[PDB]
Design a protein around this ligand. Sequence first.
Ligand SMILES: Nc1ccc(S(=O)(=O)NC(=O)c2ccccc2)cc1
Ligand SMILES: Nc1ccc(S(=O)(=O)NC(=O)c2ccccc2)cc1
Length: 164
Amino acid sequence: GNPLVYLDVDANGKPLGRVVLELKADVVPKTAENFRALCTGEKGFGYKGSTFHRVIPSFMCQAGDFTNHNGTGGKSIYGSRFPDENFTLKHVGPGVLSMANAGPNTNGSQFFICTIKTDWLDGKHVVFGHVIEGMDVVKKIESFGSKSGRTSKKIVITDCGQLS
Ligand SMILES: Nc1ccc(S(=O)(=O)NC(=O)c2ccccc2)cc1
Ligand SMILES: Nc1ccc(S(=O)(=O)NC(=O)c2ccccc2)cc1
């Protein structure tokens, strides 16, 4: 079946717990596979040790820039960027996992977890999964954001990987 992966998250060195994500490989196999491999680190790089660098309350929590840690970087397992696979899954509500980008066909490694329905992103960001467990952790992360996106605590993915 579809992969289950996890992110274990600290805030200022205090563990918040685990976010478990189901990746919709049946709908977006290429996008799901990229994220899965970045969680395991099996290509020699990935999310372990990186941060949630931009968090906006009542919107989303963004992470995945494991090279520049500021929204400019990241890379996929395929190359620096890869195309939008499809827009079949929609930004339906809290817990949606979707690709951050810099316009059409600029997927790398950055992603966001929604804390609300974000319908205006439909057709612009590739949705590829959703939170299975740990929305409480996501709400903690969200609470350390601000309108500007600046975080008020250092939010670190201390560990990540694949469960099944
Ligand atoms: N990942 C991601 C996707 C889209 C955008 S955005 O279009 O530049 N800003 C908002 O969508 C928004 C909505 C509510 C409050 C603040 C910002 C930003 C990050
Ligand atoms: N790096 C990067 C990240 C996101 C984007 S975007 O979402 O396609 N456009 C804007 O964010 C934006 C905001 C205000 C004015 C003009 C554009 C583009 C590049």
